[PDB]
Nucleic acid binder design. Structure first.
Ligand SMILES: COC(=O)C[C@](O)(CCCC(C)(C)O)C(=O)O[C@@H]1C(OC)=C[C@]23CCCN2CCc2cc4c(cc2[C@H]13)OCO4
Ligand SMILES: [Mg+2]
Ligand SMILES: [Mg+2]
Ligand SMILES: [Mg+2]
Ligand SMILES: [Mg+2]
Ligand SMILES: [Mg+2]
Ligand SMILES: [Mg+2]
Ligand SMILES: [Mg+2]
Ligand SMILES: [Mg+2]
Ligand SMILES: [Mg+2]
Ligand SMILES: [Mg+2]
Ligand SMILES: [Mg+2]
Ligand SMILES: [Mg+2]
Ligand SMILES: [Mg+2]
Ligand SMILES: [Mg+2]
Ligand SMILES: [Mg+2]
Ligand SMILES: [Mg+2]
Ligand SMILES: [Mg+2]
Ligand SMILES: [Mg+2]
Ligand SMILES: [Mg+2]
Ligand SMILES: [Mg+2]
Ligand SMILES: [Mg+2]
Ligand SMILES: [Mg+2]
Ligand SMILES: [Mg+2]
Ligand SMILES: [Mg+2]
Ligand SMILES: [Mg+2]
Ligand SMILES: [Mg+2]
Ligand SMILES: [Mg+2]
Ligand SMILES: [Mg+2]
Ligand SMILES: [Mg+2]
Ligand SMILES: [Mg+2]
Ligand SMILES: [Mg+2]
Ligand SMILES: [Mg+2]
Ligand SMILES: [Mg+2]
Ligand SMILES: [Mg+2]
Ligand SMILES: [Mg+2]
Ligand SMILES: [Mg+2]
Ligand SMILES: [Mg+2]
Ligand SMILES: [Mg+2]
Ligand SMILES: [Mg+2]
Ligand SMILES: [Mg+2]
Ligand SMILES: [Mg+2]
Ligand SMILES: [Mg+2]
Ligand SMILES: [Mg+2]
Ligand SMILES: [Mg+2]
Ligand SMILES: [Mg+2]
Ligand SMILES: [Mg+2]
Ligand SMILES: [Mg+2]
Ligand SMILES: [Mg+2]
Lengths: 193, 191, 136, 172, 197
RNA sequence: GGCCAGCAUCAGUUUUGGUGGCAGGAUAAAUCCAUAGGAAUGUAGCUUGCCUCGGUAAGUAUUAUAGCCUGUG
RNA sequence: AGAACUGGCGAUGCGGGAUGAACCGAACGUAGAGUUAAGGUGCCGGAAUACACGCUCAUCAGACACCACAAAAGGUGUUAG
RNA sequence: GCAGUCAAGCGUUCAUAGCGACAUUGCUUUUUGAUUCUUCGAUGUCGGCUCUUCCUAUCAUACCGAAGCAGAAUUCGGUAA
RNA sequence: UUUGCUCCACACAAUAUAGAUGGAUACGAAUAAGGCGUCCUUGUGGCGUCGCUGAACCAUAGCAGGCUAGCAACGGUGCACUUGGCGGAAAGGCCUUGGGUGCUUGCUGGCGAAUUGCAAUGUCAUUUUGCGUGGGGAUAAAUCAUUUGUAUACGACUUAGA
């Protein structure tokens, strides 16, 4: 699969403009300023792109970003991401996408009560880990010289190489995971006591 | 020893016109039409006259010659299938549990649904193949009846049913239960 | 609704099948299959083109679509008699094949100048045909 | 062993005082040259008589040329041969145009069907099967049927350039 | 002979195609191979499938990375066949391989360029008829290649456009032939016939 | 005449073509010609049986409205 | 493990047998041209994807001395007897 | 140590369901021997613990074929690590 | 930080080069079957023809191709422009329109060529970069340090700061 165009909305919240930077405060904040001018003239440029997507394109994804300022976090810099679109017909898809530029989508139009959903996230971090807790290896006996949270035999004499399949110390956590089958017990509304 | 020429005949009946390009055989008779690919073989078909076709193998080994005859038959049975038609008969066999056989359908389907086999709570299902049609033969106890233009499609659809009723974990010569092919024949009668 | 069964229609090894020889001191020469030895060997004879009566591998020979009356195992004089009689030589001479053989044989014998003359001619022929190919 | 000639080889028992003019025996011998052919002669003669080359003499060596070298003939061939596990007598029929041709492909056939190298074979008789319907082996009877005609399906022309611009055709 | 020779893979035998493609390179001849999914291998599918799984088990025991890599795409099955025929660890070796390119289907440029064939590797000229043989696409997809169906799609599309092209071409050459026929009988025409033209 | 080359005529070594004259042999064997006999995977003619006015088939039939084999010269 | 005769390796490179003390070829001053040996000529790799007759299709085919193994016993696979 | 071939026997009857004498062909290299080629200017000896990976001549588990398989239970054999 | 960047144009200069030296010249499919022409009932159709290799086809004459004149044709083609249309598999190329302009060896003329000395690749390609000039166009950011802790052995990660 290969991306051939990305059509962007005319206006762009600072929260996303945040994301395109590493030093927002110092910066002149020129991100997407020429692009925005593509709207000016009648529409020409963006139509042809939208049009091109429509003609080819085997899948359509939407670029959504989060409203991190509506959130207790301090982070300020929002989160941008692509979401595939599975309603009918390539063309209706981009029409939907175009219709929703700068506009907003709600959770209750994607999820409903009792739905099984999956969670995709980066696992909590633990930094550099011993072999015992990282792999659940057996603790060595108390009598052993030079320590015991280890593995006793790191391999046979042949292959005369430590192999990929034995437990070694090293990073623990901050792994990407894809959990499935988490049932939704509530879809909460914010404007609701 | 490489036989320099051996050949066979395919007779053609009053109502049908077989027609063959590359090695693709289309046989069309009163009962419909059947087509079958022979490209995997190397024989040479030859029309001599609207009631006769010859098939032959130039300079061939045993296996090659051996496949001459089976070509003859495969096109023969297309021709007979398309005239008389085929009709496989099967009877149920069970020493205590009545085997109940119906025809269900999901999404245009047509499936053969076998119930209570040896008691099994499990519901058995066999697809009805396209071209083959299934009557539960009245005036005969526990007779199912598959018929079609294509031997190979009725023979197989039957064998599909008989085999979905294999008996496991028992002495299968005491537990003889199952649907079995009980007669192989033609559709159009007197013949 | 007839039946329509292709054909596939091969040249045969059979007595009095004329063949163009392709390897050897004969080569380019025609000849006639007289008798027939095994699946792979035949006895040929080509008195008119000067090829010796001989045994030959079919693979050295190429079968032409020409045939003519020949008693199997016919001797050389008999071959030359029927050959003439059947006029095979003008028959072959007349074929696209032999015409194509004669062609390239000529092209190969041209002279640097003849070659140059050909070019001047083609330029000329091109000029009038390109015109034609532009009016309808 | 090669491409054969056929020789008459004549020899005889070195003369003596009490027995001058010894009996004279002939063999036809299929061989590539007259050197191999005299060798072969002595090889068989010491299998039949009390002689050996040391005490015998070759009298004449002559090449026998085929009578009618462009007449298709049906040969029946008798052979003796050594297999791996014991020795064996055979009859084949070979159809070609000279006895010399015929022996060339016998030797080939023994080698290929029975893995018999040239040392392990003895030609017993090679003789033209006069009247047909004495032809025994079917791989020959086959070729004797009246008005015989057969096509050669699936033609392979040998390319001369490495590349082609056509896609070939095995028509014929 | 030509600056670049594009070979239509279809109906060619892997190792014979490899054997000639290798030698061409080493001699300085750029080559592109196309439709590699329609390559053939002697022997029935099941054999060449098992043969593949033998290749498939060889790996560096201590680290399956460093060990032998298994490419599953028909082009790349083919490249393996080739690279083995080329002293590919010499500079001269790397040199010759850079003259090579293999593709599934016939992507741009090459699809409007003519492709040739290689008779001494053409299956239909080489395999004794009756012997079983294998199609790369079928083999590759059985060992994990992802893209058989797409290649099929795109080609069928390509294959439509080019029949247009052809038919349009076939129609113009008919004009040309008509044009040629009036010129027949003219002096220049009879003259050229003399000189073999 | 310093360095390197090209061609010509020759010499030593070698390699790769064209071409002339002779000697053997079954004084090659064949083809070819002549002649005697012969047969069948039997050419004409003939007979017989079906068969849309002859074409087939199964009999006779040894050069006839094809030819071949075998010896001798 | 131990004798007989010769030829070797040890003391010896060179060409071949991928590799290798002993096998095959061949024994060494510096070089030019030629021809070969043993062994090879699809590609790696110099050299016929040469010619010819068979044979063989293996859901663990086979592929060249020394050499880097297989046997009894079986097959209605196929081939010739 | 493990596996065959022949088939006299065993198995109510019945050679080969399951077994199998007298013979006889093999495989294996966790047995033990035989050897003494490598290491004596030194390659850390038994067992356990820990841990990885491999083999299959498969104990269990998936799907099968056979039985002197009524059922249940078992036994034999296949694809299987 | 000394007038920097970019696209186009030519100019000088360097530096290269796995190897220009008329043209990579486009259906598909089958091979115990096909291409092409033609007709028709439009089909697994009739009739004709072809292969047997690209040995083809196309191009090809002119100071490495100069300077010139005329005729016949109204064709071919180069080039920059302009009309409409197609191609996303890596489309980055293909087709169509229209005027302009150059060439034309389709044919017929005037002039030139030597002394590069009897051969010496006798230099005619395309890669990348550097430096001025002036025809368009454009006016950022990252890092250190500071900072958070969804991160961390150090780097790295993740926040924040006109
Ligand atoms: C009988 O035992 C020994 O001889 C033990 C030892 O002394 C090993 C101790 C070595 C040091 C001092 C380095 O620990 C020794 O000399 O080992 C040799 C030794 O020592 C390094 C190496 C040897 C010989 C080759 C490998 N092998 C392994 C160790 C060993 C073990 C033995 C053995 C000999 C060896 C030798 O006989 C019985 O079991
Ligand atoms: Mg784009
Ligand atoms: Mg801890
Ligand atoms: Mg644990
Ligand atoms: Mg845990
Ligand atoms: Mg542990
Ligand atoms: Mg301690
Ligand atoms: Mg059971
Ligand atoms: Mg039970
Ligand atoms: Mg004779
Ligand atoms: Mg010099
Ligand atoms: Mg000289
Ligand atoms: Mg001479
Ligand atoms: Mg005749
Ligand atoms: Mg010493
Ligand atoms: Mg030596
Ligand atoms: Mg060496
Ligand atoms: Mg070796
Ligand atoms: Mg020796
Ligand atoms: Mg290699
Ligand atoms: Mg080579
Ligand atoms: Mg040669
Ligand atoms: Mg041996
Ligand atoms: Mg055996
Ligand atoms: Mg056998
Ligand atoms: Mg006994
Ligand atoms: Mg019993
Ligand atoms: Mg008993
Ligand atoms: Mg043990
Ligand atoms: Mg020792
Ligand atoms: Mg020891
Ligand atoms: Mg020691
Ligand atoms: Mg040491
Ligand atoms: Mg150690
Ligand atoms: Mg394994
Ligand atoms: Mg096993
Ligand atoms: Mg019993
Ligand atoms: Mg089983
Ligand atoms: Mg496992
Ligand atoms: Mg494994
Ligand atoms: Mg370079
Ligand atoms: Mg045709
Ligand atoms: Mg047509
Ligand atoms: Mg037609
Ligand atoms: Mg062409
Ligand atoms: Mg000019
Ligand atoms: Mg590309
Ligand atoms: Mg002029
Ligand atoms: Mg500037």
């Amino acid at each position: 699969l290969r991306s051939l165009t990305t059509v962007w909305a005319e206006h762009l919240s600072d929260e996303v403009k945040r994301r395109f930077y590493k030093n927002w405060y110092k910066s002149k904040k020129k991100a997407f300023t020429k692009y925005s001018a593509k709207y000016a003239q009648d529409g020409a440029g963006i139509e042809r792109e939208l049009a091109r997507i429509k003609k080819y394109a085997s899948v359509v994804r939407v670029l959504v970003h989060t409203q991190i300022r509506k959130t207790p976090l301090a982070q300020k810099k929002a989160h941008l991401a692509e979401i595939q679109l599975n309603g009918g017909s390539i063309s209706e898809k981009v029409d939907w996408a175009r219709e929703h530029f700068e506009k907003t989508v709600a959770v209750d139009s994607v999820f409903e009560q009792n739905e099984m959903i999956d969670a995709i996230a980066v696992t909590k971090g633990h930094g550099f880990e011993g072999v015992t807790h990282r792999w659940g290896t057996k603790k060595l006996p108390r009598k052993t010289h030079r320590g015991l949270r280890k593995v006793a035999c790191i391999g046979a004499w042949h292959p005369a190489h430590v192999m990929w399949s034995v437990a070694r110390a090293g990073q623990r956590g901050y792994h990407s995971r894809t959990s499935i089958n988490h049932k939704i017990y509530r879809v909460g509304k914010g404007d609701d006591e | 020893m490489k036989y320099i020429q051996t050949e066979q005949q395919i007779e053609v009946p009053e109502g049908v016109t077989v027609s063959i390009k590359s090695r693709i055989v289309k046989v069309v008779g009163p009962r419909g039409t059947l087509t079958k690919n022979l490209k995997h073989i190397d024989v040479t078909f030859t029309k001599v006259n609207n009631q006769l076709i010859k098939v032959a193998v130039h300079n061939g080994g045993r296996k090659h010659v051996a496949a001459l005859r089976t070509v003859k038959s495969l096109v023969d049975n297309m021709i007979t299938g398309v005239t008389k038609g085929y009709k496989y008969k099967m009877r149920y066999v069970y020493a205590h549990f009545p085997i109940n056989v119906n025809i269900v359908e999901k999404d245009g389907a047509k499936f053969i649904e076998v119930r209570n086999f040896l008691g099994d709570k499990k519901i058995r299902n066999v697809p009805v193949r396209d071209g083959v049609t299934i009557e539960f033969s009245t005036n005969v106890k526990d007779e199912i009846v598959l018929s079609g233009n294509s031997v190979e499609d009725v023979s197989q659809n039957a064998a599909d049913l008989q085999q979905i009723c294999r008996v496991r974990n028992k002495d299968i010569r005491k537990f003889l239960d199952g649907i079995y092919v009980s007669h192989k024949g033609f559709i159009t009668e007197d013949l | 609704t007839d039946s329509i069964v292709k054909a596939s229609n091969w040249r045969l090894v059979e007595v009095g099948r004329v063949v163009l020889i392709k390897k050897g001191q004969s080569a380019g020469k025609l000849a006639a299959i007289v008798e027939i030895i095994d699946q792979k060997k035949v006895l040929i004879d080509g008195p008119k083109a000067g090829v010796p009566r001989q045994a030959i591998n079919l693979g050295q020979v190429v079968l032409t679509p020409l045939t003519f009356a020949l008693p199997r195992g016919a001797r050389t004089a008999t071959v030359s008699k029927k050959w003439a009689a059947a006029a095979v030589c003008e028959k072959w001479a007349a074929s696209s094949w032999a015409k194509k053989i004669a062609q390239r044989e000529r092209r190969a014998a041209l002279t640097d100048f003849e070659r140059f003359q050909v070019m001047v001619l083609r330029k000329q022929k091109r000029y009038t045909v390109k015109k034609a190919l532009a009016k309808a | 062993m090669a491409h054969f000639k056929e020789y008459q080889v004549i020899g005889r028992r070195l003369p003596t005082e009490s027995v001058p003019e010894p009996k004279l025996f002939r063999m036809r011998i299929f061989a590539s040259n007259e050197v191999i052919a005299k060798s072969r002669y002595w090889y068989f003669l010491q299998k039949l008589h009390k002689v050996k080359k040391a005490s015998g003499e070759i009298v004449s060596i002559n090449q026998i040329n085929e009578a009618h070298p462009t007449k298709v003939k049906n040969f029946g061939v008798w052979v003796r041969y050594d297999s791996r596990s014991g020795t064996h007598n055979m009859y084949k029929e070979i159809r070609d145009v000279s006895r010399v041709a015929a022996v060339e492909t016998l030797y080939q056939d023994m080698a290929a069907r029975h893995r018999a190298r040239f040392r392990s074979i003895h030609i017993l008789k090679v003789a033209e099967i006069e009247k047909t319907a004495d032809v025994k082996r079917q791989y020959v009877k086959q070729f004797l049927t009246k008005d015989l005609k057969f096509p050669l399906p699936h033609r392979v022309q040998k390319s001369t350039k490495t590349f082609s611009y056509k896609r070939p055709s095995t028509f014929y | 002979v030509e600056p670049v020779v594009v070979i239509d893979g279809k109906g060619h035998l892997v190792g014979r195609l490899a054997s000639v493609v290798a030698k061409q390179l080493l001699n300085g001849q750029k080559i592109v191979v196309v439709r590699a999914e329609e390559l053939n291998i002697s022997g029935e599918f099941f054999r060449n499938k098992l043969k593949y799984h033998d290749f498939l088990r060889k790996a560096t025991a201590f680290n399956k990375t460093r060990g032998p890599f298994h490419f599953r795409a028909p082009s790349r099955i083919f490249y393996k066949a080739l690279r083995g025929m080329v002293s590919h660890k010499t500079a001269r070796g790397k040199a010759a391989l850079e003259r090579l390119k293999v593709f599934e289907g016939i992507p741009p440029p090459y699809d409007k360029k003519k492709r040739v064939v290689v008779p001494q590797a053409l299956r239909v000229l080489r395999l004794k008829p009756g012997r079983k043989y294998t199609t790369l696409g079928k083999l590759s997809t059985s060992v994990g290649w992802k893209y058989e169906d797409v290649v099929a799609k795109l080609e069928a599309k390509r294959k439509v456009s080019s029949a247009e092209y052809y038919a349009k071409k076939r129609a113009f050459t008919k004009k040309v032939a008509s044009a040629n026929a009036t010129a027949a009988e003219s002096d220049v025409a009879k003259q050229l016939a003399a000189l073999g033209y």
